[PDB]
UniProtKB/Swiss-Prot annotation, chain A:
Annotated protein name in UniProt: Small ribosomal subunit protein uS9
UniProtKB keywords: Ribonucleoprotein, Ribosomal protein
Organism phylogeny: Eukaryota, Fungi, Dikarya, Ascomycota, Saccharomycotina
GO-annotated cellular components: cytosolic small ribosomal subunit
Tree of life domain: Eukaryota
PANTHER family in UniProt: RIBOSOMAL PROTEIN S16 (PTHR21569:SF16), RIBOSOMAL PROTEIN S9 (PTHR21569)
Curated annotation (Swiss-Prot), chain E:
Species the sequence originates in: Candida albicans (strain SC5314 / ATCC MYA-2876)
Family matches, as PROSITE patterns: RIBOSOMAL_S14
Keywords attached to this entry: Cytoplasm, Ribonucleoprotein, Ribosomal protein, Zinc
UniProt subunit comment: Component of the small ribosomal subunit. Mature ribosomes consist of a small (40S) and a large (60S) subunit. The 40S subunit contains about 32 different proteins and 1 molecule of RNA (18S). The 60S subunit contains 45 different proteins and 3 molecules of RNA (25S, 5.8S and 5S).
Function: Component of the ribosome, a large ribonucleoprotein complex responsible for the synthesis of proteins in the cell. The small ribosomal subunit (SSU) binds messenger RNAs (mRNAs) and translates the encoded message by selecting cognate aminoacyl-transfer RNA (tRNA) molecules. The large subunit (LSU) contains the ribosomal catalytic site termed the peptidyl transferase center (PTC), which catalyzes the formation of peptide bonds, thereby polymerizing the amino acids delivered by tRNAs into a polypeptide chain.
Protein name per its UniProtKB record: Small ribosomal subunit protein uS14
Cellular localisation: Cytoplasm
Family in the record: Belongs to the universal ribosomal protein uS14 family.
InterPro entries for the chain: Ribosomal_uS14 (IPR001209), Ribosomal_uS14_CS (IPR018271), RIbosomal_uS14_euk_arc (IPR039744), Ribosomal_uS14_sf (IPR043140)
Swiss-Prot record, chain F:
InterPro entries for this protein: Ribosomal_uS19, Ribosomal_uS19_CS, Ribosomal_uS19_euk/arc, Ribosomal_uS19_SF
PROSITE patterns: RIBOSOMAL_S19
GO molecular function, one term: structural constituent of ribosome
Description of how the protein assembles with itself and partners: Component of the small ribosomal subunit. Mature ribosomes consist of a small (40S) and a large (60S) subunit. The 40S subunit contains about 32 different proteins and 1 molecule of RNA (18S). The 60S subunit contains 45 different proteins and 3 molecules of RNA (25S, 5.8S and 5S).
Family membership: Belongs to the universal ribosomal protein uS19 family.
Nucleus as UniProt keyword: no
Presence of keyword Acyltransferase: no
Entry-linked SUPFAM superfamilies: Ribosomal protein S19
Record Pfam families: Ribosomal_S19
Tree of life domain: Eukaryota
Source species: Candida albicans (strain SC5314 / ATCC MYA-2876) (Yeast)
Stated name of the protein: Small ribosomal subunit protein uS19
Encoding gene per record: RPS15
Locations listed in the record: Cytoplasm
Length: 140, 102, 72, 144, 55, 129, 141
RNA sequence: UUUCAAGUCGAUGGAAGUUUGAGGCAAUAACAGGUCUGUGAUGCCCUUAGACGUUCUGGGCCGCACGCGCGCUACACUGACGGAGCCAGCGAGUAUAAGCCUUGGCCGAGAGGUCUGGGAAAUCUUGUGAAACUCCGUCGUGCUGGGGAUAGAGCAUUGUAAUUGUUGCUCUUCAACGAGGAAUUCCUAGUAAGCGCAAGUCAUCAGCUUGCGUUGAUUACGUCCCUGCCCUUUGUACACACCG
């Protein structure tokens, strides 16, 4: 077949699988254009990986991502990571590594979570309280 | 009743004997020119039971959390039905039970 | 219990509105209520029409907040 | 759908079923002041009477006002469901009714002696002013 | 006569409908996975049954 | 308000339960009668009547067939206080327990459709001070 | 290039499809739409008395376009919400069955959906054709 | 920086640099701590046929002038509703039963009912399309559309049996509460706080626990000032050890 690389981004439970193929610059979210990511207030979180490098980078590639697990906000951070990880992995494999060693520089200098998944997970709850650290009110 | 796509389901509490029987069958399915699919790691099932420590009702509210793990693996074989059963008796293990369904 | 804001629009307040809203740096639902003594619901229909009539320019559109300014 | 003006047509205080309301309240929520009329009931009589739910009480004409009080007193005649009514399967005549302001407490009362006359458990605790539906009273209901 | 009255009350779908495997108890029963054991009897048999504390 | 009046009348008065006056009420069969009362009562008769409720009515029926100068029909005592009062047993007197004693009750017509134990309180009322 | 339902925002597509179904007038509307509340967890009927049924049928159609064999029981859960038990905590409660079942039953006879094999209700051969049409007349402004 | 030692604080790299995060296990002795109401674990005392055994019926453990403790709704506009958008994880599930999880279809405003089918289960319920949340509207500082007790009438479910309303649904009624004195509790990162979901109990009933995930912070990263405990020194006429 043609030049295809497949990657994934993660937040808490949300996992976004990005497929980056060679093409005209197709960027879809679960079969929907990125111009209509509901969060809105957060539409610029996924617009950040675009405007930092320049839209000229996406002319030759088309990207179709899917996202499952997590919540409404947790899925947005997973999506923006899958696109950013997909762009770097395509350059490493189908473009010179000199170019790959540039995009990763701008992304990391702006936000580590564009490329690196956050390791925070929810702490387990312990008995004797309603939460992980919280405890039942004590009386004397 | 000759060649047969046959599924073998393996369940046990302990993984060492489960993988030995699983590996021994795969090994015996290698020297014998048979086609096989597996082993397939099914999502392990965590049987959890949370009781109170106190047999009576006094003290700090402390709880036990007991656990049990069930690991289930299925292997698909393409061999006659007579051949698969004798493989099962070769790789019989007291802990692991085997069920075979056509 | 002292608010007693007006909910029915007469003629004296109406043209007073069109004479007063333009001389505001910033108009909103609360600005209309605060200074014109009109109710909140009456303010909302006024904003959607005054904008349709061109007197008012929409800075921002939102359900819970309507940010408007003068059009001159 | 735009600001409108009126002169002399608004009526600040209304009197419906011998109850005084406020003309500057929205019509759907003004009628809830009438005892026996909740928000759910007021939404339908205004919609059955073709009184759009965007008018203040004083905006209404008498023709609309008379058309509403007619419907409330005869709900079943206006395709109002039986299950939607206040007093359905009446004790004495077995028909579905919706009692209103100057009738609710009379028939609520008539229900109270009807419980007290037979000396039922629910009627007795009603006499004492205690909860009748089984609520614990050891630690609750401590006011006066 | 008496046989129709003695132990006549239904003793199904209730807490008295079931009991511990080991200590014939009615309180603190564990029904998960069909154990049917009192919670006290479970602790003294958990290692034997195959339940261990890990976390 | 528009207009209000205040008249009243009485078609020979007579006590009535859900549109049916005492004359037809008493000799209606309880299968037909239950069709015009509450949801809890209607469910109970469809669920099947065990021997205890049907047996009590027969004794109550017989107890009236004891007095034919038309005075009170003497008391039948019972534990089944989950009994639903039916028009057939109006005017009969039954003794309904409360755990300790036999409360004596007279079946007035307005008691119909209620549970038999609801008029014999099982606890003596609290009295502080 | 072509236009699909997935290429247009959901919220303003339904406002356009609701308008079409009302002006078209062909949808059979049950007689209780002016009386009933959408869910037992709701406490009031919808505020858009004349148009709430059209918009809800429009919402059901759009949701089914993107999926496969959604039942009517699943539709009650989707539009259901948290009930306000007075002093007890909130809980999710399903929506009314009759309201959802009439819309999907009414829409199948208007030509947009049909009963799918292995349960649910698929979108029709013509169901894809006419929804994708509405999307195009939405985004011209 | 430091006794240049043990270490500590910063950067860089890293998925992870607070013992990487959280738990499970956990020493020498001790308490008259709590349980014989978990045991067909027990010694002794009591009772043992008019039983204190056991069983049936009914009631009670809920009973209400009051004080106290664990909690849930709220006192609103960073909000209520009304539509629309629509994302998790931890888990459970049956047979001649004694009936499990229940989709899909069809009735019903609902609650719920009915007919089929799937699943002893990564297969089906289930992507458990959950709720907070987001968008657009109505409301407009009002004991108001906040709040939903109390109560009347009616409709379903479970169960032999719902009366002292099991629970659910519909209409109506619409109370205190306008952010709470002296006091006092919990807490340092996916933590606190909201927000729901599942499992246990369970024929029915979760404002309870045990967990799980969604949204997601302020403020320390210090000290012995209060409080508790440990160590060192000290006094002692206590050693059943100050309950001396
Ligand atoms: Mg939803
Ligand atoms: Mg919703
Ligand atoms: Mg609420
Ligand atoms: Mg460790
Ligand atoms: Mg001791
Ligand atoms: Mg002791
Ligand atoms: Mg006990
Ligand atoms: Mg005895
Ligand atoms: Mg005894
Ligand atoms: Mg009791
Ligand atoms: Mg108790
Ligand atoms: Mg009581
Ligand atoms: Mg506690
Ligand atoms: Mg609270
Ligand atoms: Mg609440
Ligand atoms: Mg809402
Ligand atoms: Mg699943
Ligand atoms: Mg909301
Ligand atoms: Mg109010
Ligand atoms: Mg409210
Ligand atoms: Mg209420
Ligand atoms: Mg304050
Ligand atoms: Mg403190
Ligand atoms: Mg403290
Ligand atoms: Mg109970
Ligand atoms: Mg539960
Ligand atoms: Mg408990
Ligand atoms: Mg100190
Ligand atoms: Mg010494
Ligand atoms: Zn036991």
């Amino acid at each position: 077949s043609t030049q295809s690389v497949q990657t994934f981004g993660k937040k808490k439970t949300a996992t976004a699988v990005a497929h980056v193929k060679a093409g005209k610059g197709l960027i879809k979210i679960n079969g929907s254009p990125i111009t209509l990511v509901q969060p809105e207030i957060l539409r610029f979180k996924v617009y950040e990986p675009l405007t930092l490098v320049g839209l000229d980078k996406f002319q030759g590639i088309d990207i179709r991502v899917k996202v499952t697990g997590g919540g409404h906000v947790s899925q947005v951070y997973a999506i923006r990571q899958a696109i950013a990880k997909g762009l770097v992995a395509y350059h490493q494999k189908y473009v010179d590594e000199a170019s790959k060693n540039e995009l990763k520089k701008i992304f990391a200098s702006y936000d580590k979570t564009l490329l690196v998944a956050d390791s925070r997970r929810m702490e387990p709850k312990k008995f004797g309280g309603r939460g992980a650290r919280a405890r039942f009110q004590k009386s004397y | 009743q000759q060649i047969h796509k046959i599924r073998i389901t393996l369940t046990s509490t302990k993984v060492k004997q489960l993988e030995n029987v699983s590996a021994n069958i795969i090994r015996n399915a290698a020297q014998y020119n048979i086609v096989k699919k597996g082993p397939v790691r099914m999502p392990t099932k965590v049987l959890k039971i949370t009781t109170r420590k106190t047999p009576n009702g006094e003290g700090s509210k402390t709880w036990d959390a007991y656990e049990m793990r069930i690991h289930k693996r299925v292997i698909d074989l393409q061999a006659p039905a007579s051949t698969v059963k004798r493989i099962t008796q070769i790789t019989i293990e007291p802990g692991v039970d085997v069920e075979v369904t056509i | 219990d002292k608010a007693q804001h007006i909910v029915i629009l007469d003629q004296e307040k109406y043209d007073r509105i069109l004479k007063d809203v333009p001389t505001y740096k910033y108009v909103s639902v609360s600005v209309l209520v605060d200074r014109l003594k009109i109710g909140g619901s009456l303010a909302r229909v006024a904003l959607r029409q005054l904008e349709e009539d061109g007197i008012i320019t929409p800075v921002l559109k939102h359900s819970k907040q309507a940010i408007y300014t003068r059009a001159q | 759908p735009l600001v409108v003006q009126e002169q002399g047509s608004f009526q600040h205080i209304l009197r419906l079923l011998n109850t005084n309301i406020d003309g500057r309240i929205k019509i759907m929520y003004a009628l809830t002041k009438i005892r026996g009329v909740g928000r759910r009931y007021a939404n339908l009589v205004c919609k059955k009477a073709d009184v759009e739910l965007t008018k203040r009480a004083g905006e209404l004409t008498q023709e609309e006002l008379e058309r509403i009080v007619t419907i409330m007193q005869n709900p079943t005649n206006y395709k109002i469901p039986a299950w939607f009514l206040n007093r359905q399967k009446d004790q004495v005549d077995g028909k579905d009714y919706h009692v209103l302001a100057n009738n609710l407490e009379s028939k609520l009362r008539d229900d109270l002696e009807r419980l007290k006359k037979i000396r039922s458990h629910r009627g007795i605790r009603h006499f004492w002013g205690l909860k009748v539906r089984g609520q614990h009273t050891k630690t609750t209901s401590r006011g006066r | 006569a008496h046989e129709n009255v003695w132990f006549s009350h239904p003793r199904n779908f209730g807490k008295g409908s079931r009991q511990c495997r080991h200590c014939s108890s009615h309180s603190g029963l564990i029904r998960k996975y069909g154990l049917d054991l009192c919670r006290q009897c479970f602790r003294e048999k958990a290692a034997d049954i195959g339940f261990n504390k890990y976390r | 308000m528009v207009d209000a009046t205040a008249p009243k009348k009485r078609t020979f008065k007579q006590f009535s339960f859900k549109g049916v006056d005492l004359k037809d009420l008493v000799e209606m069969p309880t299968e037909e009668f239950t069709k015009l009362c509450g949801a809890r009562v209607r469910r109970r008769f469809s669920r099947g009547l065990d021997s205890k409720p049907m047996g009590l009515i027969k004794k109550l029926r017989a107890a009236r067939a004891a007095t034919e100068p038309n005075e009170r029909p003497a008391v039948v005592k019972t534990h089944l206080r989950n009994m639903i009062v039916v028009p057939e047993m109006i005017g009969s007197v039954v003794g309904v327990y409360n755990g300790k004693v036999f409360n004596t009750v007279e079946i007035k017509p307005e008691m119909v459709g209620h549970y038999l134990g609801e008029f014999s309180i099982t606890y003596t009322p609290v009295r502080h001070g | 290039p072509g236009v699909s339902v997935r290429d247009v925002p959901a919220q303003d597509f339904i406002n356009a499809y609701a308008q079409f179904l009302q002006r078209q007038g062909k949808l059979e509307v049950p007689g209780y739409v002016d009386i009933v509340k959408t869910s037992a967890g709701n406490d009031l009927p919808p505020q858009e008395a004349e148009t709430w049924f059209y918009k809800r049928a429009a919402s059901i159609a759009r949701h089914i376009y993107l999926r496969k064999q959604v039942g009517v029981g699943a539709l009650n859960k989707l539009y259901g919400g948290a009930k306000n038990r007075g002093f007890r905590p909130h809980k999710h409660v399903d929506a009314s069955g009759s309201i959802n079942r009439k819309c999907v039953q009414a829409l199948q006879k208007i030509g947009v959906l049909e009963i799918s094999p292995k349960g649910g209700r698929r979108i029709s051969e013509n169901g894809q054709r006419d929804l994708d049409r509405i999307a195009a007349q939405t985004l011209e402004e």
